[PDB]
Design a protein around this ligand. Structure first.
Ligand SMILES: NC(=O)C1=CN([C@@H]2O[C@H](COP(=O)(O)OP(=O)(O)OC[C@H]3O[C@@H](n4cnc5c(N)ncnc54)[C@H](OP(=O)(O)O)[C@@H]3O)[C@@H](O)[C@H]2O)C=CC1
Length: 325
């Protein structure tokens, strides 16, 4: 009876969501940008021993476009759960409002409109948001201070306009705000849950494509193998994926923001792990790091209690990432 729609299903996080849904036996519909991406994903699922009869794809070439999901939800009236995992990709930015904040905000509204009008059987929407909407960064960072599932990044709309880096952060905050504004205003019959991941690391659900460059967050790792250093909170992608299932499965997740952050990390600390665990790689050397004393402290025991499983630690995450390469 439960049919789960997953937007942008070929992505790094979304492929792990799709794999997790199928291991749990859920009928799954993934949106892909092309027939080839859909056939490719189905073949990955087949070659992994999963029941590929549980998976189908729909072609949605442009996920932020007006009405982009209208036809998919006509063709699949059985959808009861909609995991909106993806925001449209962005590239070289010249107009931060028009190229970053606008497509992010309008993309989520356009998706919510289509769900409300065409997804008449949808009971739960899960929004993949971001830890960026929860804690403050750069000069707005609050090192030593606690953030929890109710905290918001204080960045204002105008502050987000200043440069692409803050525009990306602001895009996450104000896209999620658009969802909250849509609920209060239009009062849809479906319930919402948010998953707010920090830096997502870990192995790909199925396959390599190109060992030379992985998804953006995992370039924190592959850059070392291949370096802009980083600091903050990490979360293993498999924990992000499991959290999306709990997000629609439980009643206590309605109106909740699940803070998907495990433990602090640095790029140097990840290099230390690769140095100790992969001796045939003795790599590259750096030193210009940040120290975590720019980061808020995460209190997410509420999330960890709702999720009810133990997170994968950084060593296992990094080890599993390297093994695929
Ligand atoms: N990874 C992280 O650390 C975090 C990621 N997120 C968010 O989660 C989402 C995906 O994360 P991740 O999986 O890591 O990124 P990936 O690049 O691995 O996945 C990107 C996905 O977005 C799809 N996509 C992008 N633009 C469009 C578009 N215009 N029309 C249709 N499909 C589109 C891609 O389609 P194709 O496969 O066809 O290229 C791909 O499926 C992003 O929105 C990201 O901001 C949130 C918090 C942290």
């Amino acid at each position: 009876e439960t049919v789960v729609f997953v937007s942008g299903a070929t992505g790094f996080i979304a492929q792990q969501i799709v794999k997790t849904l199928l291991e749990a036996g859920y009928k799954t519909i993934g949106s892909v940008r092309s027939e080839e991406k859909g056939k490719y994903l189905k073949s990955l699922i087949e070659s992994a021993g999963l029941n590929s009869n549980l998976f189908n794809y729909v072609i949605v070439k442009d996920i932020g476009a007006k009405g982009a999901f209208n036809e998919a939800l006509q063709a699949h009236p059985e959808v009861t759960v909609f995991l909106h995992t993806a925001s449209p990709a962005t590239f070289e930015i010249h107009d931060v409002e028009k190229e970053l904040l606008k497509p992010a905000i309008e993309g989520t509204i356009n998706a919510l409109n289509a769900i409300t009008v065409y997804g008449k059987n949808v009971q739960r929407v899960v929004i993949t948001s971001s830890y960026a909407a929860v804690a403050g960064f750069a000069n707005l960072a609050t090192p030593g201070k606690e953030v929890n599932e109710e905290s918001w990044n204080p960045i204002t709309y105008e502050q987000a306009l200043e440069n692409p880096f803050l525009g990306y952060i602001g895009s996450k905050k104000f896209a999620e705000k658009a969802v909250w504004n849509y609920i209060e205003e239009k009062k849809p019959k479906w319930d919402v849950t948010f998953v707010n991941p920090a830096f997502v690391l870990g192995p790909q659900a199925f396959a390599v494509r190109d060992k030379s460059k992985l998804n953006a967050s995992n370039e924190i790792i592959n850059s070392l193998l291949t370096p802009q250093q980083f600091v903050g909170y990490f979360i293993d992608v498999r924990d992000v994926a499991k959290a999306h299932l709990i997000a629609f499965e439980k009643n206590e997740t309605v109106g909740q923001r699940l803070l998907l952050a495990n433990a602090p990390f640095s790029s140097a600390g990840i290099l230390d792990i690769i140095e100790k665990d992969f001796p045939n790689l003795k790599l590259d050397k750096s030193k210009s790091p940040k120290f975590e004393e720019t980061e808020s402290v995460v209190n997410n025991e509420k999330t960890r209690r709702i999720l009810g499983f133990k997170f994968i630690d950084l060593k296992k995450s990094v080890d599993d990432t390297i093994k695929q390469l």
